[PDB]
From a paper:
The functional protein has 3 well-differentiated domains connected by linker regions that provide flexibility to the general structure.
Crystallization trials with full-length [name] systematically resulted in proteolysis of the sample through the linker regions and only the choline-binding module (CbpLCBM) was incorporated into the crystals. The crystal structure presents three residues of the N-term linker (Thr92-Ser94), the CBM that is composed of nine choline-binding repeats (residues Gly95-Glu270), and three more residues from the C-term linker (Val271-Ala273). CbpLCBM is folded in a left-handed superhelical arrangement of the choline-binding repeats, each of them comprising a β-hairpin followed by a loop and a coiled region that is linked to the next repeat, as previously reported in other CBPs15161726.
Numbering used by the authors: 92 to 273
């Protein structure tokens, strides 16, 4: 009898302790498919974990990693319809329900930049609205409030050439409240 990992007819198989092929199951970091062949460079849906996994070229599952537009979490599970923090890039991302990362787009009160990174404590220009927005320290857009000498209106858009904040302050066309006091 045989136990452990065995390569046969071009594929890797895993023999369990009773010398039998493991099929439709994990063995360590590796997944054995319906015919017993080790998954490699491919996506697998595990019905028991209710999640997609990506097996890399060496057979081991991807974790804390991108595969194309898709993110595998620390437990290997593909992210779906959720926020994740990638500690290696020090960046938040939003993975849509289809799995692919959001980019150049709002998600709730948050904005994902062109490479998917959530904006945070920074100004962004929304090409579709043709207006500046300010994302606060937690990512959520500022509204009905000042950021420095600029005012974000109730929909978050930067004010220009108008009276703002209870009609008390005038911002010029450049958006700046020009401070001239006695
Ligand atoms: C990564 N998924 C398998 C979930 C989609 C592939 O297009
Ligand atoms: C390590 N295994 C033998 C499981 C596969 C080699 O890629
Ligand atoms: C753009 N990301 C790096 C965030 C994923 C692409 O693989
Ligand atoms: C093997 N799983 C990927 C299912 C869990 C991580 O240990
Ligand atoms: C609000 N602006 C983007 C115009 C300037 C601040 O960076
Ligand atoms: C709440 N988000 C996850 C969207 C950003 C972290 O503050
Ligand atoms: C002085 N600012 C106008 C910038 C803030 C007023 O609250
Ligand atoms: C989320 N936006 C800033 C795009 C609109 C909120 O009113």
């Amino acid at each position: 009898t045989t136990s452990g990992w065995v390569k046969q007819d071009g594929a890797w198989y895993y023999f369990d302790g009773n010398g039998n092929l493991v099929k439709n199951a994990w063995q360590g970091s590796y997944y054995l498919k319906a015919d017993g062949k080790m998954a490699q460079s491919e996506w697998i849906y595990d019905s028991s974990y209710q999640a997609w996994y990506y097996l890399k070229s060496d057979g081991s599952y991807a974790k804390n990693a991108w595969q194309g537009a898709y993110y595998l979490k620390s437990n290997g599970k593909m992210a779906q319809g959720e926020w994740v923090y990638d500690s290696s890039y020090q960046a938040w991302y939003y993975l849509k329900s289809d799995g692919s990362y959001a980019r150049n787009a709002w998600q709730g009160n948050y904005y994902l930049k062109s490479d998917g990174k959530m904006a945070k404590g920074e100004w962004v220009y929304d090409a579709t609205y043709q207006a500046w927005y300010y994302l606060t320290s937690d990512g959520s857009y500022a509204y009905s409030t000042w950021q420095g000498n600029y005012y974000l209106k109730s929909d978050g858009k930067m004010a220009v050439n108008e009276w703002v904040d209870g009609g008390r302050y005038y911002v010029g066309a450049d958006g700046v409240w020009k401070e001239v006091q006695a």
